Design a protein around this ligand. Structure first.
Ligand code: SAH
Ligand code: CL
Ligand code: K
Ligand code: K
Ligand code: K
Length: 219
């Protein structure tokens, strides 16, 4: 039958207002609430995301996991003129829907969708995509890659003192090894934010982990 993704874009095109990102977000959340797709209702986590963007005003953001573009629209609508979101998405069909979603929102010029696995694209950011360091990273992809990809970002020199990591779904279904790492590491200062999931009626959360620079090269 019809995919969730094609139906979400359909609903937006039929109900939201072109070039009104807020209306696009609200349409996605309205439809996904009606369908009882708990992981696709983004307004609770979106309050936390918005606060992070408003406080830190990042010029260059990396997103891991685009899906249909909800979080890309959510962040890009608050980015300044000339700022940039790079979003990595392994599934080309999701990349395609995300592109259409951004076009409808009028935010396509602020976003570059990178089609591939985060583990393959991250090592290309420096030379192929001319990245110095990221101002913010939003982690929202496969749970078992949150910690590995954080370590990879570190190794590739893509984090600087002050880079803000914001990770979704750290409680449900959970990213406990990622949490133990950033909370235990002197290279990250961490804050936890609770975020509700409907239907399951559970308190998920997001973790903000601000990189402090690398640990001493010595013991
Ligand atoms: N290793 C990987 N690299 C890139 N994308 C990945 C990945 N593993 C999974 N994904 C993608 O991660 C996405 C998770 S859902 C993302 C939801 C989105 N951030 C929102 O808030 O609306 C899926 O679209 C999936 O295809
Ligand atoms: Cl984990
Ligand atoms: K900035
Ligand atoms: K996720
Ligand atoms: K810490």
């Amino acid at each position: 039958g019809d995919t969730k993704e094609q139906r979400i874009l359909r609903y937006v095109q039929q109900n939201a207002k072109p070039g009104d990102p807020q209306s696009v977000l609200e349409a996605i959340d309205t439809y996904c609430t009606q369908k009882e797709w708990a992981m696709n209702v983004g307004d609770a986590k979106g309050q936390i995301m918005d606060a992070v963007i408003r406080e830190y005003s990042p010029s260059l953001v990396l997103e891991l996991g685009a899906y249909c573009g909800y979080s890309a629209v959510r962040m890009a609508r608050l980015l300044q003129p000339g700022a940039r979101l790079l979003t990595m998405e392994i599934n080309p069909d999701c990349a395609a829907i995300t592109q259409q979603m951004l076009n409808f929102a009028g935010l396509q010029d602020k976003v570059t969708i990178l089609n591939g696995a985060s583990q393959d694209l991250i090592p290309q950011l420096k030379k192929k995509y001319d990245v110095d360091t990221l101002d913010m990273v939003f982690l929202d992809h496969w749970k078992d890659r949150y910690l590995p990809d954080t370590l990879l970002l570190e190794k590739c020199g893509l984090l600087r003192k002050g880079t803000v990591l914001l990770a979704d779904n750290v409680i449900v279904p959970g990213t406990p090894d990622f949490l133990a790492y950033v909370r235990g590491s002197s290279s990250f200062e961490c804050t936890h934010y609770s975020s509700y999931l409907e239907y399951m009626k559970v308190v998920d959360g997001l973790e903000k982990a601000i990189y402090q620079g690398p640990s001493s090269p010595d013991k």
